[PDB]
UniProtKB/Swiss-Prot annotation:
This is Endolysin. InterPro entries: Endolysin_T4_type (IPR034690), Glyco_hydro_24 (IPR002196), Lysozyme-like_dom_sf (IPR023346), Lysozyme_dom_sf (IPR023347), Phage_lysozyme-like (IPR052619), T4-type_lysozyme (IPR001165). Optimum pH is 7.3. Changing S117F: 10-fold decrease in enzymatic activity. The lineage of its organism: Viruses, Duplodnaviria, Heunggongvirae, Uroviricota, Caudoviricetes. The active site is at E11 (proton donor/acceptor), D20 (proton donor/acceptor). Changing N132 to M/F: 2-fold decrease in enzymatic activity. It catalyses: Hydrolysis of (1->4)-beta-linkages between N-acetylmuramic acid and N-acetyl-D-glucosamine residues in a peptidoglycan and between N-acetyl-D-glucosamine residues in chitodextrins. HAMAP family: ENDOLYSIN_T4. Endolysin with lysozyme activity that degrades host peptidoglycans and participates with the holin and spanin proteins in the sequential events which lead to the programmed host cell lysis releasing the mature viral particles. Once the holin has permeabilized the host cell membrane, the endolysin can reach the periplasm and break down the peptidoglycan layer.
């Protein structure tokens, strides 16, 4: 397993504009298009992202391209973030994937505020980190996904994904 398969599981894949768990316009593998309630606006951002008149539908290859860009951007965001990088650099490969998933989902800003969890993680206090991570709106809103990611972080294995 790896980061890509990991997020492809958690995000699914949809070729038509759809609304996410928060009701925002999204497409592909979790590619948020806009927080605006306007489909038009969303269709406009879609066309801008793709480079063509999509009419709100993309192909699989197009969805995967956006996905590669987003995973890439997530990693770079982590490395460019002074609160995140040191955490990231201290982790093994599996746990790094867990932190990338959270950033992909919540944004760098969002993740950098799990201050307390980040410190336990950096200290390698897995179980404690795990309990602290569950005390969050993130977990109450998307509990099944949150649990898979938290288990990953805690154990450093891919068991939650098998
Ligand atoms: Cl884009
Ligand atoms: Cl979920
Ligand atoms: Kr974290």
């Amino acid at each position: 397993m790896n980061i890509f398969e990991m997020l492809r599981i958690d995000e699914g894949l949809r070729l038509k504009i759809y609304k996410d768990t928060e009701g925002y316009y999204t497409i592909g593998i979790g590619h948020l298009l806009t927080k605006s309630p306007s489909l038009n606006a969303a269709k406009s951002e879609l066309d801008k992202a793709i480079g063509r008149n999509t009419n709100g539908v993309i192909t699989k290859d197009e969805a995967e391209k956006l996905f590669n860009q987003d995973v890439d951007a997530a990693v770079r965001g982590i490395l460019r973030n002074a609160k995140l990088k040191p955490v990231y650099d201290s982790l093994d490969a599996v746990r790094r994937a867990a932190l990338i998933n959270m950033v992909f989902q919540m944004g760098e800003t969002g993740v950098a505020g799990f201050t307390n969890s980040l410190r336990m993680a950096q200290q390698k206090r897995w179980d404690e980190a795990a309990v602290n991570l569950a005390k969050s709106r993130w977990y109450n809103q998307t509990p099944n996904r949150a649990k898979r990611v938290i288990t990953t972080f805690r154990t450093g294995t891919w068991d939650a994904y098998k």
